[PDB]
Design a protein around this nucleic acid. Sequence first.
RNA 1: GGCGACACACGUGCUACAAUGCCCACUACAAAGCGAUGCCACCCGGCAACGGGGAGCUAAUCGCAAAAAGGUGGGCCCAGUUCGGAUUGGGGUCUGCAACCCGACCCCAUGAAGCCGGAAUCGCUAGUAAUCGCGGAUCAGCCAUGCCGCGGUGAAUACG
RNA 2: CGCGGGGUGGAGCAGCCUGGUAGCUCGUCGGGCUCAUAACCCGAAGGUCGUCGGUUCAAAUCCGGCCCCCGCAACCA
RNA 3: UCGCCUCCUAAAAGGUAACGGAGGCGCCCAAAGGUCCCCUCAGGCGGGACGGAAAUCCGCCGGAGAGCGCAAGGGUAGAAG
Lengths: 179, 82, 119, 60, 23
Amino acid sequence: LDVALKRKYYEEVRPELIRRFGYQNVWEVPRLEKVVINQGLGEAKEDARILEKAAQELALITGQKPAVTRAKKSISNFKLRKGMPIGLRVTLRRDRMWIFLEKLLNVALPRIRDFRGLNPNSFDGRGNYNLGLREQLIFPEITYDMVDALRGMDIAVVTTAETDEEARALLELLGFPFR
Amino acid sequence: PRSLKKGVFVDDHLLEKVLELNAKGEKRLIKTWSRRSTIVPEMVGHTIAVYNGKQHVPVYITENMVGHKLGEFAPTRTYRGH
Amino acid sequence: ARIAGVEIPRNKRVDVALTYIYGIGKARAKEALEKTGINPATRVKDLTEAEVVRLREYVENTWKLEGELRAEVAANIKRLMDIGCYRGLRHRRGLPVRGQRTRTNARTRKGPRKTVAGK
Amino acid sequence: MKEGIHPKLVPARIICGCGNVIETYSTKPEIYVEVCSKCHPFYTGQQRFVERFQRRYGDS
Amino acid sequence: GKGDRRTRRGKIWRGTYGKYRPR
RNA sequence: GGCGACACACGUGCUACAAUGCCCACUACAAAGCGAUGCCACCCGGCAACGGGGAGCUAAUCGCAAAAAGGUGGGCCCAGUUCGGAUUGGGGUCUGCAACCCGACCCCAUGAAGCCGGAAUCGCUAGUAAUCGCGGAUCAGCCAUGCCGCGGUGAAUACG
RNA sequence: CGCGGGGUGGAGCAGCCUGGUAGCUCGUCGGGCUCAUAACCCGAAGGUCGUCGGUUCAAAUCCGGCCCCCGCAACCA
RNA sequence: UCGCCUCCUAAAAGGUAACGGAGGCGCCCAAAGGUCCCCUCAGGCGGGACGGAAAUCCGCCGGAGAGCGCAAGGGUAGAAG
Ligand SMILES: [Mg+2]
Ligand SMILES: [Mg+2]
Ligand SMILES: [Mg+2]
Ligand SMILES: [Mg+2]
Ligand SMILES: [Mg+2]
Ligand SMILES: [Mg+2]
Ligand SMILES: [Mg+2]
Ligand SMILES: [Mg+2]
Ligand SMILES: [Mg+2]
Ligand SMILES: [Mg+2]
Ligand SMILES: [Mg+2]
Ligand SMILES: [Mg+2]
Ligand SMILES: [Mg+2]
Ligand SMILES: [Mg+2]
Ligand SMILES: [Mg+2]
Ligand SMILES: [Mg+2]
Ligand SMILES: [Mg+2]
Ligand SMILES: [Mg+2]
Ligand SMILES: [Mg+2]
Ligand SMILES: [Mg+2]
Ligand SMILES: [Mg+2]
Ligand SMILES: [Mg+2]
Ligand SMILES: [Mg+2]
Ligand SMILES: [Mg+2]
């Protein structure tokens, strides 16, 4: 429960945030709830085994094994029978959010090839931020000696900030590299 | 390309109308045949009428035309696909 | 272990394991092993994690490399394209640039042979 | 959490080209990392690695 | 190979000298 | 300016697809022909192209000159690879009034097609065929992989 | 208007019954053999399936209308 | 054409004819059944690797226009989903 960013959030993120927009109540503060990682894998339609290795990999980097999304409706143009698994998706929060998030900023992102920044337009207008990854081996637990194929994910970041600039601020001061 | 230390080469009958304009006060249209010639910094901004083989083509000159000979910008044959 | 980008090389050898880096080969490399005073003919499978972080942070921080390098070549052409340069028309609409004839084989710069019809 | 099925998530120590990364709280302690960023290389502490001809040819 | 200008064997072929064919 | 255009089609070629092979070090063995408007030894700068200097020879006297295969030692380990060197970026060098169109060459990065080629089809009977270097003409330079010559090592097989 | 079969690369014909996947002969194109052409040999291209709507996840394929085609039939009067 | 179902014709109870207007049925399901607990849609707008109008994710908006094996009608999330 002592996680450094949870620490750094309360001491030196909240203050700089209160004094930047000016908040009557302590709850009106932008708070960081429920970052959610979603691996869209049509790349496992007929091969079921592609998923079970994918999830052992994703759990290794989140400490939760993910739940498996299954196919909403049946769509023809891609194979897609109406019940199949087409990806993994894990909701992690509440100190598991943090030990994941803190790790991502230190090691994962700076390991991304060519990294000129995180495009700062992914604010969905009600103050949450999503981004997408290409390869899985940018995390520390992935050895390049266990990647059967390269595949990435979408990352949701939910935030109680009613607007985007407060979402912007909460994440910057949290240490998010923008442009 | 051009041997460095030997030029760089601008046909001096052309240079003679640009240091005659950039360091003059008059600065307007020009019309040459010398495509063998390298370029500015002292012609950049003028409008030279280059020659292709058949007639005189207008070119405006900028700083990304660093040291490109004057014919790199007035090509010599016509295609337009089909 | 990993170098510019990730570009993990391994077993083969240490002098060639650097050819397989983009932006480097046989010349920009065989020098940078005496810059770290490192025997070439050893193998990236066995070499001290010490002498790895000399190279890793030598080369990334020596010159333009795999990512930023391809980054450079790219906008070097949109510089020649979008500008009207002759050498860049042979790019804007896709042909050989420097020299050669096009009444015959350009099949590297010109794509596979697209036969049409004869008189 | 559902006891059983999760990775163990012990505190860790992790490295980079720079000094050690402290917090780390991870599955599989003691991992190494080619690039973490608090550097003053790599984009934080920005630094680099039209221009040419007006210099080289200018007198020649 | 007789056309790898960056080797001794190819510089002989072309007839030139350099770093890979000195004198 | 063009003869150097490029959706494409054919002829003659070069370099390859590799381990009888690639690379690097050291070390040998030729012939013919050119060259004082030139060939440049040797010294110095330069990774080098080249640039400084500079000695000799109208040349069996001096120079282009290193012949290459080979030899020796060693590295690569069957990999689209240290195979292969196409395309493209950047930096130069010399010829020449001038090198964008449209030159040769050196260097750094790039490493593409290609894993013996469908129907078809060519040359060669002995110092020949294969394979390896060298010179000359033209010629400022050069698009020479071309042409005419030179020697190095050196097969296969013809019942008919 | 009546019953029945049909419309598919340039020609002619499969495929539709039984939804997923368009095939055969010829022609056309590129290249071979030939002095040359045909023959012959080696490669290649080439189509939304009359049409509109509906059905389904998916329509040459199943359904409705329309439109052309062939066929049969209009007898007592 | 011939039996069964749905709508209309049908004149606001029921019923109602024509070689009147339009469609379905001759099955299916061992879970598509019983029950207990839980969940709530289509669609639109913004965001997000390979994701394209629509594979998956996250946000707000969405009272039922979704779903209910198959035709239509009635019904239905306070569930029949
Ligand atoms: Mg919010
Ligand atoms: Mg050329
Ligand atoms: Mg040309
Ligand atoms: Mg080679
Ligand atoms: Mg030559
Ligand atoms: Mg040459
Ligand atoms: Mg010579
Ligand atoms: Mg000309
Ligand atoms: Mg000609
Ligand atoms: Mg040739
Ligand atoms: Mg040959
Ligand atoms: Mg002689
Ligand atoms: Mg020297
Ligand atoms: Mg000579
Ligand atoms: Mg092989
Ligand atoms: Mg290939
Ligand atoms: Mg030229
Ligand atoms: Mg004979
Ligand atoms: Mg050979
Ligand atoms: Mg010559
Ligand atoms: Mg030649
Ligand atoms: Mg020769
Ligand atoms: Mg009668
Ligand atoms: Mg009634």
